[PDB]
Scaffold this motif. Structure first.
Motif, PDB file in Angstrom:
ATOM      1  N   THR A 660       0.841  -1.189   0.000  1.00  0.00           N
ATOM      2  CA  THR A 660       0.000   0.000   0.000  1.00  0.00           C
ATOM      3  C   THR A 660       0.879   1.242   0.000  1.00  0.00           C
ATOM      4  OG1 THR A 660      -2.027  -0.887   0.981  1.00  0.00           O
ATOM      5  CG2 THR A 660      -1.464   1.388   1.518  1.00  0.00           C
ATOM      6  N   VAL A 661       0.586   2.178  -0.902  1.00  0.00           N
ATOM      7  CA  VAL A 661       1.328   3.428  -1.019  1.00  0.00           C
ATOM      8  C   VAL A 661       0.362   4.589  -0.827  1.00  0.00           C
ATOM      9  CG1 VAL A 661       1.085   3.805  -3.504  1.00  0.00           C
ATOM     10  CG2 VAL A 661       3.123   4.616  -2.314  1.00  0.00           C
ATOM     11  N   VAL A 662       0.787   5.575  -0.039  1.00  0.00           N
ATOM     12  CA  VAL A 662      -0.006   6.764   0.253  1.00  0.00           C
ATOM     13  C   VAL A 662       0.857   7.993   0.004  1.00  0.00           C
ATOM     14  CG1 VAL A 662      -1.240   8.069   2.012  1.00  0.00           C
ATOM     15  CG2 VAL A 662      -1.469   5.584   1.918  1.00  0.00           C
ATOM     16  N   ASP A 663       0.313   8.956  -0.742  1.00  0.00           N
ATOM     17  CA  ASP A 663       1.000  10.212  -1.020  1.00  0.00           C
ATOM     18  C   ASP A 663       0.027  11.391  -0.999  1.00  0.00           C
ATOM     19  OD1 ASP A 663      -0.245   9.084  -3.145  1.00  0.00           O
ATOM     20  OD2 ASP A 663       1.370   9.402  -4.591  1.00  0.00           O
ATOM     21  N   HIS A 664      -1.012  11.312  -0.168  1.00  0.00           N
ATOM     22  CA  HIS A 664      -2.069  12.314  -0.106  1.00  0.00           C
ATOM     23  C   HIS A 664      -2.182  12.857   1.308  1.00  0.00           C
ATOM     24  CE1 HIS A 664      -4.428  10.514  -3.785  1.00  0.00           C
ATOM     25  NE2 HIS A 664      -3.295  11.098  -4.132  1.00  0.00           N
ATOM     26  N   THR A 665      -2.213  14.182   1.443  1.00  0.00           N
ATOM     27  CA  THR A 665      -2.816  14.847   2.596  1.00  0.00           C
ATOM     28  C   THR A 665      -2.224  14.499   3.960  1.00  0.00           C
ATOM     29  OG1 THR A 665      -4.543  13.180   2.987  1.00  0.00           O
ATOM     30  CG2 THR A 665      -5.001  14.878   1.313  1.00  0.00           C
ATOM     31  N   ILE A 666      -1.167  13.685   4.017  1.00  0.00           N
ATOM     32  CA  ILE A 666      -0.521  13.339   5.277  1.00  0.00           C
ATOM     33  C   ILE A 666       0.991  13.446   5.209  1.00  0.00           C
ATOM     34  CG2 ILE A 666      -2.444  11.866   5.910  1.00  0.00           C
ATOM     35  CD1 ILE A 666      -0.655   9.431   5.330  1.00  0.00           C
ATOM     36  N   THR A 667       1.549  13.811   4.062  1.00  0.00           N
ATOM     37  CA  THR A 667       2.983  13.827   3.858  1.00  0.00           C
ATOM     38  C   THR A 667       3.560  15.194   4.218  1.00  0.00           C
ATOM     39  OG1 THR A 667       2.553  14.313   1.529  1.00  0.00           O
ATOM     40  CG2 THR A 667       2.940  12.017   2.135  1.00  0.00           C
ATOM     41  N   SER A 668       4.889  15.255   4.288  1.00  0.00           N
ATOM     42  CA  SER A 668       5.561  16.481   4.692  1.00  0.00           C
ATOM     43  C   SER A 668       5.282  17.599   3.694  1.00  0.00           C
ATOM     44  CB  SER A 668       7.066  16.244   4.812  1.00  0.00           C
ATOM     45  OG  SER A 668       7.359  15.397   5.910  1.00  0.00           O
ATOM     46  N   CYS A 669       5.291  18.832   4.198  1.00  0.00           N
ATOM     47  CA  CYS A 669       4.841  19.986   3.431  1.00  0.00           C
ATOM     48  C   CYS A 669       5.935  20.632   2.590  1.00  0.00           C
ATOM     49  CB  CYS A 669       4.250  21.039   4.371  1.00  0.00           C
ATOM     50  SG  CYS A 669       2.449  21.008   4.459  1.00  0.00           S
ATOM     51  N   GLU A 670       7.199  20.220   2.743  1.00  0.00           N
ATOM     52  CA  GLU A 670       8.302  20.792   1.982  1.00  0.00           C
ATOM     53  C   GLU A 670       9.074  19.784   1.144  1.00  0.00           C
ATOM     54  OE1 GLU A 670       8.067  20.429   5.111  1.00  0.00           O
ATOM     55  OE2 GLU A 670       9.916  19.714   6.054  1.00  0.00           O
ATOM     56  N   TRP A 671       9.105  18.513   1.532  1.00  0.00           N
ATOM     57  CA  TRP A 671       9.778  17.473   0.766  1.00  0.00           C
ATOM     58  C   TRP A 671       8.781  16.707  -0.091  1.00  0.00           C
ATOM     59  CZ3 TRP A 671      14.711  18.470   1.810  1.00  0.00           C
ATOM     60  CH2 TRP A 671      15.062  18.910   3.090  1.00  0.00           C
ATOM     61  N   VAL A 672       9.312  16.046  -1.114  1.00  0.00           N
ATOM     62  CA  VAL A 672       8.593  14.996  -1.821  1.00  0.00           C
ATOM     63  C   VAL A 672       8.770  13.713  -1.025  1.00  0.00           C
ATOM     64  CG1 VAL A 672       8.421  13.670  -3.941  1.00  0.00           C
ATOM     65  CG2 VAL A 672       8.896  16.119  -4.044  1.00  0.00           C
ATOM     66  N   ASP A 673       7.673  13.010  -0.769  1.00  0.00           N
ATOM     67  CA  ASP A 673       7.741  11.862   0.120  1.00  0.00           C
ATOM     68  C   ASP A 673       6.480  11.027  -0.020  1.00  0.00           C
ATOM     69  OD1 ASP A 673       6.369  14.015   1.103  1.00  0.00           O
ATOM     70  OD2 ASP A 673       6.725  13.518   3.213  1.00  0.00           O
ATOM     71  N   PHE A 674       6.552   9.807   0.506  1.00  0.00           N
ATOM     72  CA  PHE A 674       5.408   8.906   0.464  1.00  0.00           C
ATOM     73  C   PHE A 674       5.530   7.851   1.555  1.00  0.00           C
ATOM     74  CE2 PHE A 674       7.650   5.343  -1.464  1.00  0.00           C
ATOM     75  CZ  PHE A 674       8.695   5.958  -2.113  1.00  0.00           C
ATOM     76  N   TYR A 675       4.378   7.333   1.978  1.00  0.00           N
ATOM     77  CA  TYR A 675       4.299   6.230   2.925  1.00  0.00           C
ATOM     78  C   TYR A 675       4.094   4.929   2.163  1.00  0.00           C
ATOM     79  CZ  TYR A 675       3.838   9.497   6.814  1.00  0.00           C
ATOM     80  OH  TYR A 675       4.059  10.481   7.747  1.00  0.00           O
ATOM     81  N   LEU A 676       4.811   3.886   2.574  1.00  0.00           N
ATOM     82  CA  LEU A 676       4.742   2.579   1.927  1.00  0.00           C
ATOM     83  C   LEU A 676       4.674   1.495   2.987  1.00  0.00           C
ATOM     84  CD1 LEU A 676       5.153   1.550  -1.225  1.00  0.00           C
ATOM     85  CD2 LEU A 676       7.268   0.649  -0.268  1.00  0.00           C
ATOM     86  N   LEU A 677       3.622   0.681   2.936  1.00  0.00           N
ATOM     87  CA  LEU A 677       3.508  -0.530   3.740  1.00  0.00           C
ATOM     88  C   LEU A 677       3.736  -1.712   2.806  1.00  0.00           C
ATOM     89  CD1 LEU A 677       2.600  -1.564   6.688  1.00  0.00           C
ATOM     90  CD2 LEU A 677       0.435  -2.025   5.566  1.00  0.00           C
ATOM     91  N   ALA A 678       4.822  -2.450   3.039  1.00  0.00           N
ATOM     92  CA  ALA A 678       5.252  -3.520   2.149  1.00  0.00           C
ATOM     93  C   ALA A 678       5.172  -4.907   2.763  1.00  0.00           C
ATOM     94  CB  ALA A 678       6.693  -3.276   1.689  1.00  0.00           C
ATOM     95  N   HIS A 679       5.432  -5.047   4.059  1.00  0.00           N
ATOM     96  CA  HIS A 679       5.468  -6.359   4.680  1.00  0.00           C
ATOM     97  C   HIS A 679       4.061  -6.817   5.052  1.00  0.00           C
ATOM     98  CE1 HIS A 679       4.982  -3.907   8.216  1.00  0.00           C
ATOM     99  NE2 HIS A 679       4.980  -4.957   9.016  1.00  0.00           N
ATOM    100  N   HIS A 680       3.927  -8.121   5.270  1.00  0.00           N
ATOM    101  CA  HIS A 680       2.649  -8.729   5.614  1.00  0.00           C
ATOM    102  C   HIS A 680       2.431  -8.613   7.117  1.00  0.00           C
ATOM    103  CE1 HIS A 680      -0.524 -11.835   5.954  1.00  0.00           C
ATOM    104  NE2 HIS A 680       0.182 -12.254   6.989  1.00  0.00           N
ATOM    105  N   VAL A 681       1.389  -7.887   7.508  1.00  0.00           N
ATOM    106  CA  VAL A 681       1.091  -7.613   8.909  1.00  0.00           C
ATOM    107  C   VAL A 681       0.098  -8.651   9.405  1.00  0.00           C
ATOM    108  CG1 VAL A 681       0.582  -5.788  10.556  1.00  0.00           C
ATOM    109  CG2 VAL A 681       1.318  -5.202   8.241  1.00  0.00           C
ATOM    110  N   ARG A 682       0.388  -9.232  10.570  1.00  0.00           N
ATOM    111  CA  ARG A 682      -0.450 -10.266  11.164  1.00  0.00           C
ATOM    112  C   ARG A 682      -0.873  -9.975  12.595  1.00  0.00           C
ATOM    113  NH1 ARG A 682       0.300 -14.836  11.161  1.00  0.00           N
ATOM    114  NH2 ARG A 682       1.225 -15.260   9.112  1.00  0.00           N
ATOM    115  N   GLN A 683      -0.211  -9.054  13.294  1.00  0.00           N
ATOM    116  CA  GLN A 683      -0.435  -8.814  14.719  1.00  0.00           C
ATOM    117  C   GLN A 683      -0.331  -7.310  14.958  1.00  0.00           C
ATOM    118  OE1 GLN A 683       3.010  -9.818  17.640  1.00  0.00           O
ATOM    119  NE2 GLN A 683       1.301 -11.080  18.352  1.00  0.00           N
ATOM    120  N   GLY A 684      -1.484  -6.644  15.001  1.00  0.00           N
ATOM    121  CA  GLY A 684      -1.547  -5.217  15.251  1.00  0.00           C
ATOM    122  C   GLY A 684      -2.025  -4.432  14.049  1.00  0.00           C
TER     123      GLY A 684
END
Ligand SMILES: [Mg+2]
Ligand SMILES: [Mg+2]
Length: 758
Positions: A660-684
């Motif tokens: 899952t990749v997110v680049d909307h409305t939650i990223t830093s206001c001066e850098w180019v950046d993105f959030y990435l969830l890559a691993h398989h989550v099982r607990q939490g």
RNA sequence: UUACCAUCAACAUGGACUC
RNA sequence: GAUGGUAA
């Protein structure tokens, strides 16, 4: 920064959108006619003339924020309470901020703290806890209560409130009662037990709900002793406690708990004296009891408490919002400044990147939905396999039979993987002293001269022998080595899987290549840095550096740099980069056009320095290559983030899928950046990873950087499946950990051509 | 030390009148 | 560094 290359997906976060009603954040510079000592008097002086400014003032001593525009110049007069001086105060407009401007942010937090304290929630450390929630366990007279870690951030979508759940654990019995029990069981010595339990542990005083860490304990002072208060009077501890809080210390023969300074105290110990002597009768220890810690059944229920599914997390956030809304005074406190929260957590839209294809020699397969391919790697031949024909197996006598099956099991699984193995040289040890291990390994290494790997079986769980073995086989006498704990090979029904995993690890250590992934960037070179901090102390931090030296990202060049100060880090990294480029030229007969750096271990505070100073310094190194100007791209990876993503299922909020990749409305206001969830989550809940691009001279489109990062997440060979960070960063972390923890030295340069650090 | 992941604790960045 | 979970 925003691109689209995959299926859209509906997520939610632990972010509650804040709404601003005015555009009236006016900053004023306030000056006083005489030099006025102490900010309290200035704040009172401003308070008395509130008819001019109002009652929504945020004042800190020099800059005054208002939600209403005063006149261009405002002059007022007042009288001092002490000297009866005539103070002419001036108010002048400085600037007209927007409600969300990254500068009027750090007092919205003060307003929110006031609100949460107005909800009757105690402040402990930097979190808001609820003493009116007493789910006890009554096994060691323990109490757990929940609270929130909450703040007001602003991102490129606006303002948000970031809220996370947490729990605090506190004993019911006072420190006095537990030390009394300690002394009750024994009588000869109360040094060891009480001193060890108290010293290093953190206690809390409940008459003010404040935490102190206890540096020492003295059996030498009593409440009858005295301390000087405000340089006015030497008062007894009993009388000081009675005067301030009106509590009586019943039995006076007790120790006093010494927390001498808080050493840092912002810049330094201006309040150097410190010397806090807390009473043991009014203190309560904080933490999970060690006797509870060893006991599994007690830990199980507390683990159920701490761990929360996304549904329970979202429910807790909803409960906090409802509590804030219900209390009218808190809502008024928030709305005095024009702010107003929403009724639910903000809902966002991300996207799911396309799945990658994994290639083995003579076969290829598309990665499955859960991003795990453990079966195929052990069922088909790898890209490159190195045959072992001369290797030694060192084993103690008591483990003799237990060793044999392992070798036998290694002869039944080497077929499918395509690796060729011959029977080892068996070496039985007379005794289990580390000296015997080192002597026998050194003897065979010196004599035979053809050993391709040394496999040592450790009987007892002791780390000194492991450290000695690794120091011998990676620093003094370079040869790849494997260490196997006898418990792992002690049980059948898990021998086949562990045997396959160990064999793949040895093949990687010898110079093998398990699998690969398609790379779309031609003449690309990939770099990864990471850092290691000593938990013990000693303050030598080691930085590891790993750089690909071929066109398919299956060979790596590894270096490590030792330095406590920051002077030599940059030039040693320049030396590492120059060596890596020379090796790349030697292997490929051409220098790389594009270089991608994945920097990790950088906290937020230094993110400004690394962007501005270190990267140009590294780029300066390309001037010794006869007019060679590559195209660099540099990222900064942050694993520790407090943002949670919940995929919005039709009924309840569930854990999000990998990729899952997110680049909307939650990223830093001066850098180019993105959030990435890559691993398989099982607990939490799914905690993504934040990538910040601090330099891009290649003009890579955002889709391409995200795709390259996700592809690199598939190339960690010690775990078949996707990991959190890119493979070079994890390799650098492991290399630095081995060099700083076990070896206390840099590994021999002979071994830096393979992945010996697995 | 067959690995990865999770809570905790170190760690590092810093950050922030009362005994 | 402890306890728990997971795995041809
Ligand atoms: Mg890392
Ligand atoms: Mg290993």
């Amino acid at each position: 920064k925003q691109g689209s290359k995959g299926t859209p997906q509906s997520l939610g976060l632990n972010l509650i959108k804040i709404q601003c009603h005015n555009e009236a954040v006016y900053q004023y510079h306030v000056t006083f006619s005489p030099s006025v000592e102490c900010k309290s008097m200035r704040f009172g002086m401003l308070k008395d003339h509130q008819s001019v400014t109002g009652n929504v003032t945020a004042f800190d001593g020099s800059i005054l924020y208002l939600p209403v525009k005063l006149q261009q110049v405002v002059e007022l007069k007042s009288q001092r309470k002490t000297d009866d001086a005539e103070i002419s105060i001036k108010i002048q407009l400085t600037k007209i901020l927007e409600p969300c401007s990254d500068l009027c942010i750090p007092f919205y937090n003060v307003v929110f703290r006031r609100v949460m304290k107005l909800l009757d929630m105690k402040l402990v450390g930097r979190n808001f806890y609820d003493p009116t929630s007493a789910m006890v366990l009554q096994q060691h007279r323990l109490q757990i209560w929940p609270g929130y870690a909450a703040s007001i951030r602003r991102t490129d979508g606006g303002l948000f409130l970031l809220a996370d759940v947490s729990h605090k654990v506190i004993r019911n019995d006072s420190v006095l009662d537990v030390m009394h029990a300690i002394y009750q069981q024994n009588k000869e010595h109360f040094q060891d037990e009480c001193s060890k339990l108290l010293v290093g542990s953190i206690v809390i005083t409940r008459y003010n709900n404040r935490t102190y860490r206890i540096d020492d304990v003295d059996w030498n002072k009593t409440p009858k002793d005295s301390f000087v208060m405000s340089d006015g009077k030497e008062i007894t501890f009993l009388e000081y406690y009675s005067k301030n809080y009106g509590i009586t210390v019943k039995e006076d023969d007790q120790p006093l708990l010494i927390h001498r300074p808080s050493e840092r105290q912002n810049n330094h110990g201006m309040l150097l004296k410190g010397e806090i002597l807390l009473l043991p009768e009014l203190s309560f220890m904080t933490g999970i009891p060690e006797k509870m810690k060893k006991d599994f059944r007690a830990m199980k229920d507390l683990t159920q408490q701490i761990n929360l599914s996304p549904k329970q997390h979202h429910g807790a956030l909803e409960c906090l919002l409802q509590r804030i809304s219900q209390n009218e005074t808190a809502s008024n406190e928030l709305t005095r400044w024009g702010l107003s929260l929403h009724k639910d957590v903000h809902k966002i839209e991300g996207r799911l990147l396309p799945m990658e294809r994994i290639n083995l020699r003579n076969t290829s397969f598309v990665t499955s939905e859960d991003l795990n391919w453990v079966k195929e790697v052990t069922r088909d031949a790898s890209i490159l396999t190195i045959p072992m024909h001369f290797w030694a197996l060192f084993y103690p006598k008591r483990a003799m039979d237990q060793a044999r099956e392992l070798v036998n099991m290694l002869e039944k699984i080497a077929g499918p993987i395509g690796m060729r193995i011959s029977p080892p040289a068996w070496v039985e040890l007379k005794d289990d002293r580390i000296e015997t291990y080192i002597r026998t390994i050194q003897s065979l290494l010196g004599v035979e001269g053809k050993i391709q790997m040394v496999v040592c079986i450790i009987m007892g769980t002791r780390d000194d022998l492991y450290g000695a073995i690794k120091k011998l086989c990676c620093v003094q006498s370079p040869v790849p080595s494997q260490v196997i704990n006898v418990r792992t090979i002690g049980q059948p029904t898990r021998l086949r899987s562990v045997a396959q995993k160990i064999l793949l690890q040895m093949n990687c250590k010898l110079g093998g290549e398990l699998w690969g992934v398609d790379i779309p960037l031609k003449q690309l070179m990939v770099i990864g840095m990471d850092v290691y901090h000593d938990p013990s102390r000693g303050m030598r931090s080691v930085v590891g550096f790993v750089a690909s030296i071929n066109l398919t990202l299956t060979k790596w060049y590894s270096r490590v740099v030792f330095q406590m100060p920051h002077q030599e880090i940059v030039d040693s990294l320049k030396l590492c980069l120059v060596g890596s480029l020379k090796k790349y030229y030697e292997v490929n007969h051409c220098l790389p056009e594009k270089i991608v750096v994945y920097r990790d271990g950088v906290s937020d505070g230094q993110l400004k320095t690394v962007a501005n100073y270190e990267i140009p310094q590294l780029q300066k190194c390309f001037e010794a290559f006869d007019n060679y100007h590559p195209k660099m791209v540099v990222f900064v990876v942050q694993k520790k983030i407090s943002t949670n993503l919940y995929l919005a299922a039709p009924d309840h909020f569930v854990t999000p899928s990998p990729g899952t990749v997110v680049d909307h409305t939650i990223t830093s206001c001066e850098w180019v950046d993105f959030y990435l969830l890559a691993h398989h989550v099982r607990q939490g809940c799914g905690i993504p990873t934040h990538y910040i691009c601090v330099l891009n001279t290649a003009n890579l489109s955002p889709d391409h950087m995200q795709r390259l990062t996700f592809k690199l997440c598939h190339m960690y060979w010690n775990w078949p499946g996707t990991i959190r960070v890119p493979a070079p960063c994890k390799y650098a972390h492991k290399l630095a950990f081995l060099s700083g923890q076990i070896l206390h030295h840099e590994p021999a340069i002979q071994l830096c051509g393979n992945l010996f650090f697995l």
